């Protein structure tokens, strides 16, 4: 059966500025099947207050979801997105690079 590996992007809704409210995003796309675990981490620990968009898919039938949470960037806080899927041998962690 068909399986497609999620692409993962972690990023803020607005350009990051320390001490200013914002949204932390983890966008996962191009995956199949739809069963997927996605967590946002703050200093390595899962964030309780996280929502996600409604499951939708692309022209190639692959799925996409946006996971997001309200947050305020601080100079020393670290954020990541942890994603698990059947196509991954182990769960994948992507750090937020607040630069770029």
């Amino acid at each position: 059966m068909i399986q497609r590996t999620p692409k993962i992007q972690v990023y803020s809704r607005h350009p990051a500025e320390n001490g200013k409210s914002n949204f932390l995003n983890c966008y996962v796309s191009g995956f199949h099947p739809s069963d997927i675990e996605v967590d946002l981490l703050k200093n390595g620990e899962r964030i309780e207050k996280v929502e996600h968009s409604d499951l939708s898919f692309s022209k190639d039938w692959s799925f996409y979801l946006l996971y997001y949470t309200e947050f305020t960037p601080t100079e020393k806080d670290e954020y990541a997105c942890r994603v698990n899927h059947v196509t991954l041998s182990q769960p994948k962690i992507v750090k937020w690079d607040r630069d770029m």
Partner: protein
């Protein structure tokens, strides 16, 4: 310009753990406006755009009634398809369905479409003529001929050229503030030292709408597409989109590089230089 309405339906079987999960979403162009999730407590079709929230009780009762019926259809489909493929009762499977319509700039019918996929691959689809079918395989053939005899196409065509475009036009009017805008991308470049002799030039497009955009890097004019890391266009979560494109460049050669941005909301293509 032209516009589209699309509905996306996903159904996933959960053997020995109750009925399958059903999720429905509706889009006008790149804007989501409704959703149904069979695991939610409400059991109603729900709004996901401000301009649809005041549609009224009749509208909400009606879509709820119809979307539950879609949910039941997919539940029977999962049972049927497993039979066509002679498959184990223990595994989880997936049915996907998409349909919708386009209108032109004049808001007149342009095209319609209606497609299924089973476990992530084409199964059967309505042809552009709206009268015939394409069957991916042997299993679908059975569906093909069954629908041919039931005159299923004709009734789809009636919906696509009528109700579908009728309501697309009504939504475009209701949400014309959201749906008939274009937000031009706000663009900028960043520079990062990869080493002592290399650097990353990243070209950013932010807060644009609709999703369509082209970001290209060139060196002296020669497309560096092969050397360009380009991310998928991604939702900012506020209804706008984001994209970027990056090249690794020899330190000292920044002036040779330009980033070219084409978007609907721009009066002219943008050419960014580092300087």
């Amino acid at each position: 310009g032209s516009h589209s309405m699309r509905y996306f339906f996903t159904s996933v079987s959960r053997p020995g753990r109750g009925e399958p999960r059903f999720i429905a979403v509706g889009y006008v162009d790149d804007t989501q406006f409704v959703r149904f999730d069979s695991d939610a407590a409400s059991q109603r079709m729900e709004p996901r755009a401000p301009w649809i929230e005041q549609e009224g009780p009749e509208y909400w009762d009606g879509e709820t009634r119809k979307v539950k019926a879609h949910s039941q259809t997919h539940r029977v489909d999962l049972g049927t398809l497993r039979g066509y493929y002679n498959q184990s009762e223990a595994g989880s499977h997936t049915v996907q369905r998409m349909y919708g319509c386009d209108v032109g700039s004049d808001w007149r019918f342009l095209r319609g479409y209606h497609q299924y996929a089973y476990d992530g691959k084409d199964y059967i689809a309505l042809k552009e003529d709206l009268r015939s079918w394409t069957a991916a395989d042997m299993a679908a053939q059975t569906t093909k001929h069954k629908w041919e005899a039931a005159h299923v196409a004709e009734q789809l065509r009636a919906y696509l050229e009528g109700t579908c475009v009728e309501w697309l036009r009504r939504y475009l009017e209701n949400g014309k503030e959201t749906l008939q805008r274009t937000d031009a991308p706000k663009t900028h470049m960043t520079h990062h030292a990869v080493s002592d002799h290399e650097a990353t030039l990243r070209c950013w497009a932010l807060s644009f709408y609709p999703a369509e955009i082209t970001l290209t890097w060139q060196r002296d004019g020669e497309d560096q597409t092969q050397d360009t890391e380009l991310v998928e266009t991604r939702p900012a979560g506020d209804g706008t989109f984001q994209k970027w494109a990056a090249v690794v460049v020899p330190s000292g050669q920044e002036q040779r590089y330009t980033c070219h941005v084409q978007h609907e909301g721009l009066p002219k293509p943008l050419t960014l230089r580092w300087e």
